[PDB]
Amino acid sequence: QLTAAQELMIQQLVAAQLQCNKRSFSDQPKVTPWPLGADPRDARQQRFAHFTELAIISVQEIVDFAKQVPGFLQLGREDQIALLKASTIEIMLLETARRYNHETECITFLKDFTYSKDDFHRAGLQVEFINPIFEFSRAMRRLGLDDAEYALLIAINIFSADRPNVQEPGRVEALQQPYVEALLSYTRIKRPQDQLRFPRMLMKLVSLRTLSSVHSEQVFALRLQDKKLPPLLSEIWD
Amino acid sequence: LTAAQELMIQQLVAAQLQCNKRSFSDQPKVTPWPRDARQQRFAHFTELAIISVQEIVDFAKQVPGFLQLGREDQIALLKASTIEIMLLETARRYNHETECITFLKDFTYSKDDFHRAGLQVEFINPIFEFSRAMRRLGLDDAEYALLIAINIFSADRPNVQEPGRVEALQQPYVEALLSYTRIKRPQDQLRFPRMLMKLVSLRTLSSVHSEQVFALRLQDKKLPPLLSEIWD
């Protein structure tokens, strides 16, 4: 059985997740609306802007989230910054997968709005990034994670000691381990008869690293098409 | 551990052992380790890298499931794996007492020797941090071999046409490792998670390696043909 500490650390995470997601419902109508009624280059830019604008919202939700993960604020500020520079896209990819719906083959963001493979392509993104996103999301759906599992995976993802420019990786590892132990024990209990579900979970952190590279390749490729990231996204990903 | 599991693991270990005997019994054919010797130490590094690539390809071929994928997937999985397997293998060859990487008698390389070959700081330190991490895990020959098998059958590499078939090939090796680590160290449950987590590390490490290649090109230091096929 889960310990009280372990249950609390899941409940802490799931609840922080919810308070950070109020940024999503408030800032939903503020955004550049997705262009209805468009011909064949005006609309291509608006969709792109729209996608950046949701990304910004997510970056700020991930900042706010991390600040509430116990231990995070007590890491040196440079390591905090370094963990969030690296884990941000990956948390976004988890959140994208978490909102994937296999009936419609569409991803949900900010409560209501949904996107297809083709919306992503209508925003000027290339197939080399879009296809892995949807395979990841499909893969993540075959694992059937609940909120607790996703939460724990995001916490583990933040506390990755081997990110670039971490100056006290040891302190990061010490914060990561309890969350990994928690997930181990959680998966055991939920699914006693599936000894491979936990490993498959950790293996998604492997996929997330490569997907992080593919995203950098995508932002690289986007500047050749007059599409430079806005200021808050430039400082994380250029 | 089932008969079929003992068979799979014995095979991987026996192939690693033969690969090593084959590739690294005799003295390597290499530019003698000495602007003159900037290119010479690099070339040297490049020629060791090639011999490891050959060793790894020889081993991949003997991993059950591999030679039964479509040729394009065989190429795709090796292309992405090669540097990662090299990093595992380097960690295997690491000697913490001495801080060097020993291919065979008299072919050892220190953090300095790397720097002399033209290699950035940005690449070398991750290499050595990763290696002394792997040692603290204390993997044995069956574990290293299985990790390598698992790394090869990563369904999410670029250009993989049959990701479902690759993931099904991974499964039994993950299973064999899980069983194996359960038995070897019954009262160390995080051992296995820790091993998988190094696969994460290797992905980031591969990208740090691509940055080293692109950086070298800037100093007119281009990969030779056998390595260029794979990395640029």
Ligand SMILES: O=S(=O)(c1ccccc1)N(CC(F)(F)F)c1ccc(C(O)(C(F)(F)F)C(F)(F)F)cc1
């Ligand atoms: O969660 S995301 O912000 C998202 C944006 C729009 C619609 C749905 C979801 N995210 C999707 C991902 F799968 F990658 F996680 C996403 C993040 C960043 C990007 C970009 O960096 C940019 F510019 F839009 F901000 C880029 F398009 F360049 F790839 C695109 C999508």
Ligand SMILES: O=S(=O)(c1ccccc1)N(CC(F)(F)F)c1ccc(C(O)(C(F)(F)F)C(F)(F)F)cc1
């Ligand atoms: O095992 S390696 O082949 C090796 C080469 C020389 C001396 C010791 C070990 N390998 C080491 C690593 F840790 F990175 F895996 C290695 C692989 C690739 C490289 C390079 O690609 C090149 F050109 F030298 F081959 C580069 F230096 F550019 F990174 C260097 C070393």
